[PDB]
Design a binder for this molecule. Structure first.
Ligand SMILES: COc1ccc(-c2c(-c3cc(Br)c(O)cc3O)noc2NC(C)=O)cc1
Length: 208
């Protein structure tokens, strides 16, 4: 397990998200579904010139899986997946500029719900999750697990759990007072409100 420090600007963003009073927390789900859609768009596009890129799975879709016993909401997609370099350095490089723009927008009157316009919507997960685990698999690369409970650090390891084929699984370990996001009616409501036109099937699993 390797441990890394967030860039200071990203740590500052995470602290703002965790500490600012803001009731409209449900927007986290739109942001993660949007990221999944983006990753699905990319594998679809690349498959048009190299069909073998779908050897790791032809189905392009998103599953939402609540588990009340583990207190997790999991978002699974079969998108392009992230590489080790994506997780450790490269996406963070991009996030630095988006965070700067977002911060300046907030100071100037914008609200947290506009976060995705700056390319850093992932971090809205910390509105509802005490810990986020991201399991991801890109073609021709290994399966990795990224994880953070904020506080300025994250970890990355090669994942020895169930093989995914290709794509990304975001496991939200929900805060104790945010368990509404495990309820079927609540998730359905949020998907219909904010993610109704996503161009891939979204299957909301039910609990056993
Ligand atoms: C908004 O920035 C993004 C958006 C998506 C990704 C991504 C992902 C990805 C990342 C997150 Br977090 C997520 O919730 C879902 C995803 O499928 N998998 O490959 C990618 N790789 C690419 C290039 O999309 C990475 C950065």
């Amino acid at each position: 397990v390797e441990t890394f420090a967030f860039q200071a600007e990203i740590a500052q963003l995470m602290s703002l998200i965790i500490n600012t009073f803001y009731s409209n927390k449900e927007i986290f789900l739109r942001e993660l579904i949007s990221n999944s859609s983006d990753a699905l768009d990319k594998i679809r596009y690349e498959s048009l010139t190299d069909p073998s890129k779908l050897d790791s799975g032809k189905e392009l879709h998103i599953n939402l899986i609540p588990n009340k016993q583990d207190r997790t909401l999991t978002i699974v997609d079969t998108g392009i997946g992230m590489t080790k370099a994506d997780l450790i350095n490269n996406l963070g490089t991009i996030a630095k500029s988006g965070t700067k723009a977002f911060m300046e927008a907030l100071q100037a009157g914008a609200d947290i719900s506009m976060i995705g316009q700056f390319g850093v919507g992932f971090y809205s997960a910390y509105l509802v999750a005490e810990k986020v685990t991201v399991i991801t698999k890109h073609n021709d690369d290994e399966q990795y697990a990224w994880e953070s409970s904020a506080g300025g650090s994250f970890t990355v390891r090669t994942d020895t759990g169930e093989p995914m084929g290709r794509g990304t699984k975001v496991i939200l370990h929900l805060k104790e007072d945010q368990t509404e996001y495990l309820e079927e009616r609540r998730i359905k409501e949020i998907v219909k409100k904010h993610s109704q036109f996503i161009g891939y099937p979204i299957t909301l699993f039910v609990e056993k």
